[PDB]
Design a protein around this ligand. Sequence first.
Ligand SMILES: Cn1c(=O)c(=O)n(C)c2cc(N3CCOCC3)c(NS(=O)(=O)c3ccc4c(c3)CCCC4)cc21
Length: 112
Amino acid sequence: MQLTPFLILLRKTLEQLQEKDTGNIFSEPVPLSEVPDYLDHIKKPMDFFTMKQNLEAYRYLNFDDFEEDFNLIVSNCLKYNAKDTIFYRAAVRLREQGGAVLRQARRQAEKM
Ligand SMILES: Cn1c(=O)c(=O)n(C)c2cc(N3CCOCC3)c(NS(=O)(=O)c3ccc4c(c3)CCCC4)cc21
């Protein structure tokens, strides 16, 4: 694990985003065994574990690329699930609570 201020900030931000997912429903890839048609509709699955692996492999080089993968967690969920579902309501909540986390983190990244 390589240590730079930027990577430490992304590590901290990822932890703050996962803290908002109190049910851990976005912690790991959507289980394709339970959902055989998921890849028919979703082109780029995303979850917080995949993000952590991307981060630890030093594959997020800028804040934009990190935030883009977070936005996929949300947008994939809203796309696949009906509005009256626990998952869709959870994605809406994550979008709201995670947006405030990202705003403050992005401001700190811009000063690097
Ligand atoms: C299909 N799908 C998505 O599109 C998605 O965005 N997310 C976030 C999904 C998340 C999950 N898991 C939820 C539990 O933590 C691990 C991930 C599943 N797994 S599951 O076994 O299908 C399942 C489990 C529970 C429940 C259900 C289904 C149905 C509602 C009641 C609770 C599927 C997800």
